[PDB]
Design a protein around this nucleic acid. Sequence first.
DNA 1: AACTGGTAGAGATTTTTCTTAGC
DNA 2: GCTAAGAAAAATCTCTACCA
DNA 3: AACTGGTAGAGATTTTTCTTAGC
DNA 4: GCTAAGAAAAATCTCTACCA
Lengths: 32, 47, 270, 270, 69, 31, 252
Amino acid sequence: IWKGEGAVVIQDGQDLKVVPRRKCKIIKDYGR
Amino acid sequence: GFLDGIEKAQEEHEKYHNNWRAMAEDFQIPQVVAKEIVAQCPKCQVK
Amino acid sequence: GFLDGIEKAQEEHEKYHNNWRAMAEDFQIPQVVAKEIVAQCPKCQVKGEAMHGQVDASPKTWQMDCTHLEGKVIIVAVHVASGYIEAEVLPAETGKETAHFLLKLAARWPVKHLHTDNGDNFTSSAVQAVCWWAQIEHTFGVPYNPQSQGVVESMNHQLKTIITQIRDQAEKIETAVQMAVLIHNFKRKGGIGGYSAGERIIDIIASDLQTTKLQNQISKIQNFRVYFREGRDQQWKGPATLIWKGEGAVVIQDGQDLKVVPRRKCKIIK
Amino acid sequence: GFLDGIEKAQEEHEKYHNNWRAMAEDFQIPQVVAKEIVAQCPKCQVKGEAMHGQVDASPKTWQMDCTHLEGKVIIVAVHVASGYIEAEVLPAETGKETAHFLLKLAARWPVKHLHTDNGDNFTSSAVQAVCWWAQIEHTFGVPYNPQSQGVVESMNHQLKTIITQIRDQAEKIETAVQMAVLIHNFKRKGGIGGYSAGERIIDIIASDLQTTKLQNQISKIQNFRVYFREGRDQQWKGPATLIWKGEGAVVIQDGQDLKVVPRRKCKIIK
Amino acid sequence: IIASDLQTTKLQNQISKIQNFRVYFREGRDQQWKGPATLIWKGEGAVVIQDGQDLKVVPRRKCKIIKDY
Amino acid sequence: IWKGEGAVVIQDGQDLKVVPRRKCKIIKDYG
Amino acid sequence: FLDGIEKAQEEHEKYHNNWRAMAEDFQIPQVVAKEIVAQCPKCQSPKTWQMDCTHLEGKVIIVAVHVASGYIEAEVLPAETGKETAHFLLKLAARWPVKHLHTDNGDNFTSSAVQAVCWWAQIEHTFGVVESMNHQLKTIITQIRDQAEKIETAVQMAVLIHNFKRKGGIGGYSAGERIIDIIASDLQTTKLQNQISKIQNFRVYFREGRDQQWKGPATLIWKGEGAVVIQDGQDLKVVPRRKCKIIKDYGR
DNA sequence: AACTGGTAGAGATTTTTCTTAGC
DNA sequence: GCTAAGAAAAATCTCTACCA
DNA sequence: AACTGGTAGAGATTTTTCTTAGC
DNA sequence: GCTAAGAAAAATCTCTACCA
Ligand SMILES: C[C@@H]1CCO[C@H]2Cn3cc(C(=O)NCc4ccc(F)cc4F)c(=O)c(O)c3C(=O)N12
Ligand SMILES: C[C@@H]1CCO[C@H]2Cn3cc(C(=O)NCc4ccc(F)cc4F)c(=O)c(O)c3C(=O)N12
Ligand SMILES: [Cl-]
Ligand SMILES: [Cl-]
Ligand SMILES: [Mg+2]
Ligand SMILES: [Mg+2]
Ligand SMILES: [Mg+2]
Ligand SMILES: [Mg+2]
Ligand SMILES: [Zn+2]
Ligand SMILES: [Zn+2]
Ligand SMILES: [Zn+2]
Ligand SMILES: [Zn+2]
């Protein structure tokens, strides 16, 4: 949802959560 | 141009279900539109 | 996806003739596809490429043009490497007076290359016969492109400003033209070496003659053949003449071509 | 010495009109004397100073001009800070149609300053009466200097290229003019913010209104008077309003003038 | 028979992707933009174009060269 | 360094290079 | 360096060389060798032209010859009045540096128009090679006459053949190489003279070795990076820069 | 397939030179 | 006696109009 | 004493992003 | 699992014609 400098906001299971960037891997998604 | 290449690549993936690097090298279209042609098919997965 | 966006963008450019940023923002297609949609249109594509060239500046190149002043016809010739002006007043703009002016100029100074525009007097049989008899290479510019002969039109501007400066000291216009030629050639300094135009043309031609005689006397008694190794493939080429051996690279002459080879890929044989 | 050189250089410039480097090299006088000899001559001094100005770009300034295309008369008005074009086809070039076009434009958009050239239709009693009734400040350019209204002549060039692009889709020339206005205003992007002209004029006017209302609400409840010490002499001036206190400098308002004072030369009194 | 056809098609593809250009130029007294042509020689300053079996020399400041992707 | 027929070898800032003949002016520059 | 100056002074004392040869041989700069020549008591034109008129097949030709090289400029006049001779002199003075003109005591050369042209162009006119040049030009004109229709084309073709195609003399050069070399040598001399006066507007106080007194004001000749050449008492000497003080001298 | 913009002057800014006060 | 501040004078860099 | 050149596109060059081989 | 090479794609900088 939002990619910050040190924080990352994700949506999962109708829930929003904030994970720091050193525990996350961002990939592209071709899921049309 | 390669707009007719995009049309022929859509027909070719509709028949034979190629991958994206093969269509990008054969029809001389860029890699983004070839990956999108693979992505909009429900049976194939880009890898 | 954006394939329907590509089809709608093609119909949108067919009606409205957008640029690529409008299509890439409104239809969310990548910029390479939008640039291709614009680049495959014939009603677009109206723009140059924004660069300038560089004219010939050999030590024996002259440029010629004609101009009008107070109902007269002036003909101007300029030596390009120095800025040296010869000018005359013609009674008419035919080809016979142009051939006569070219013959006088070729009888005074060494001319080997002449550059002109495509006027009716420069493209004539009389000028062609004079160029054949005096062995001059005549070249023409691209039609309706006055930037090819930039030096002679710039000297037209300078000559007209000088003529307006010293106009009240003469009765006729031919006297004022010759006084303007003298004032330009010998009474204005500044440029490459702080010279005037007469000192610069003397320096250029004398230096050319002296350096040809010096390198003839040097190269007639040479030695030290050099075999070098160059190219994409590690091959070996024929005998070349060593010219100058310096700290870092060597200068060789092969097939009347000058090359600079590093010191690691060459071998000297006496 | 060189005093006889100075006298001979004055007579030489009186006859030949040298530049200063020729006299400073031939007569061995210093360069300040040669520059003075050239600078005290009236037949010389023909050159500008090689700089450009910058036109007004207030958020309510408009510029207007007329042009010709296929035997018709187009009148173009441009909003300067955004690039927004209104254009019409006039049956004649009199002052009544220009006053009517100006009245329609002033009835649509907020106009407070108008800039034009010195044509026969813009300098008229009808345009003066419309400007008086609608409270518009009308200014004119320096005569025979088209660079003062640079934006409207540039938009004349862009409008003519668009009209040549979409010419075969219309029957008359008025339809082609209005289609070119639509294509320019809404189908071309790129510029300051990546906007088109319509999005940019909306953004500019809305931002101006919002920032006036915000700073009115801020400045109606302010406090913290500030006495500062500035000038060439260490004097003291009257009460000024503190606006913003930052690390390094403070911003004060005194006599409806904004100033930036360093933090050492000011004192805050509640 | 098939392998030599593969080598011939690869070499023809390279030769076809060398010099497939189009040129939109501007020439004449009334300097209007004209249709496509074929580029022959490209020097620094001017280009030589083939158009309607006519050879023309246009400066690079008055022409636009479209390549292929 | 050397003046050929269609090329000129010059040394500039201890760097040797080859320029065409139509892009050079060779003088002695008394001054 | 100092050995080079001593060898150059002894060589000039024996053989009286010129300054270009000494500067090339003994590897001293040009201003020092020019001062060595300028101090010798036993050692103390490129802009002179001659004009004449002639007749050929009913036409009036006018010939101007640069004397020191043999360089010919010719023209065909419509008449023999003073205004056409003044126009030819103005064109000649506008193309080449003319400083001293030599003519005969004809009618058209003694005229108010020619005197006004000489006044405006600053030429010294003197009334008395050209007959030999007229003879040689008429031989070339009768040699290539069948290749032209009019007489002006034949005159200009003979001028071209004489200037650039006939070689002779000591080195085997034509007339154009001779006139260009002569004028270039004169230009080099004038530039060196300007540098000489601009350097010699100074003065030097120098301190000898094993002494704390400053010596007399010697005239500066060459100011190097680490050496200074001065003239004092008709003697040239080289002092290093850390024992010298250079001041201006207003001693006109 | 082998062609092409340039010249000179006005100010602004950086570097060199020349005189003099101070320790 | 030596050195640094300060001002004058010379050198260099950027930008414009006009040439049919 | 209160006036003034600008807009958009074509290439060249530098920066960011995306896929894959190798340890 | 992690990292660096390499290539595609997007962003920025410099320069030109035309506006009576
Ligand atoms: C009939 C001949 C042959 C066919 O072309 C015409 C018209 N022409 C026009 C200009 C001209 O427009 N000069 C101004 C100018 C403008 C821009 C620039 F970059 C350089 C410039 F000199 C000339 O100088 C010129 O000589 C001619 C000419 O001779 N002719
Ligand atoms: C009779 C009115 C009032 C008196 O002046 C004339 C002539 N004029 C001439 C141009 C013109 O030359 N435009 C080309 C152009 C050239 C250079 C530049 F920097 C900008 C440019 F637009 C105009 O645009 C224009 O409007 C007028 C005009 O209106 N008039
Ligand atoms: Cl032309
Ligand atoms: Cl005006
Ligand atoms: Mg012409
Ligand atoms: Mg011309
Ligand atoms: Mg107008
Ligand atoms: Mg206008
Ligand atoms: Zn599929
Ligand atoms: Zn289009
Ligand atoms: Zn003057
Ligand atoms: Zn002697």
